[PDB]
Amino acid sequence: AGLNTAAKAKGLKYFGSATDNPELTDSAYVAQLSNTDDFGQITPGNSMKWDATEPSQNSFSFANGDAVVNLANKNGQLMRCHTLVWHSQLPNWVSSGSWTNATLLAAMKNHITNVVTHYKGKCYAWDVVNEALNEDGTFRNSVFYQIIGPAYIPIAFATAAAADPDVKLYYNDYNIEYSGAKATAAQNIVKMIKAYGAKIDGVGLQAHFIVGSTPSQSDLTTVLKGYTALGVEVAYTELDIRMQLPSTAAKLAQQSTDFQGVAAACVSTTGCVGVTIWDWTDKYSWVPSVFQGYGAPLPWDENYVKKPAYDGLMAGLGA
């Protein structure tokens, strides 16, 4: 029994984990990442982003993305492919370009087509557009929004669907897990894509939460159902629950209940297909370098030992 067996027993497609290429040289890490009792699905943390896959214009590079796919293939795990259009981790040629609408669109479409076609048949889902919203629900002023306007979003989805018509296409974002302007604006992106006549299959809720300040099971579920009502599926795509350090037994127990609610909200909502944690061990979490004074966010500690949050997750999944 483990997270992925329990998830599947409740009708979810998977419980999964992100990873990154340098971690695949750690034997012990790879052994646990490869334990399909716990993980039925993998997301590449960095090697399918634009700077990795198209470091110069029309010059694609897939070796590192492929290495993650190969590991999922060896294990029989599903892949989520992450991410086509995003304002972060762009190569210099995109950011520094003197663009027109026509020339940026051409570059964006060529990016999407190339990368999606390369991974055709290999991915459960793609995060097609990531983080397009500001917290108030207005559109983020990325290069894509400044040059192309809002149509970049549906154009991106239509391009992806043309290159691989079977893969689930997701809009992915953070702070759209709880009721508010940003979640309403995420519902509105789903509606906009469909009004354009483009395909969207899923909403990805990143779920980067904080211990003792995580949305309640009730509000998480209201929000999930807000998206599933629209005829899309949903998933928690980058779950982690960062704690203000130092770690204590009380914070670890809080963290357990916070993870428990997330799993339980997913099981509660028909059309929630899965949960991915953003890596699985505190040793390799992205959190401490970005969020000063915060850490210990995942269900295993830095020594690869289960924390109480593992049992929270199991409880939330009814195991």
Ligand SMILES: *[C@@H]1O[C@H](CO)[C@@H](O)[C@H](O)[C@H]1NC(C)=O
């Ligand atoms: C860019 O071109 C597209 C496709 O023709 C169009 O939908 C969109 O409105 C244009 N945007 C701008 C800012 O001109």
